[PDB]
Amino acid sequence: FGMGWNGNHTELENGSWGPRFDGSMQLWGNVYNNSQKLKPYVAMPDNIK
């Protein structure tokens, strides 16, 4: 699973309690200058390594 709380999806979470990975394009993070980063909802295992 990816970003979220209570099991629901969320753009700002500091944690991974979200829906199961779709591969479906979703938003994340804050809005800057009326724009926002949008990316495949996919896991990234190495992201700390």
Binding site: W5, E13, N14, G15, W17
Partner: peptide
Amino acid sequence: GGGGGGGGGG
């Protein structure tokens, strides 16, 4: 006599 942790956000 001890020490406090804090929880996080979510």
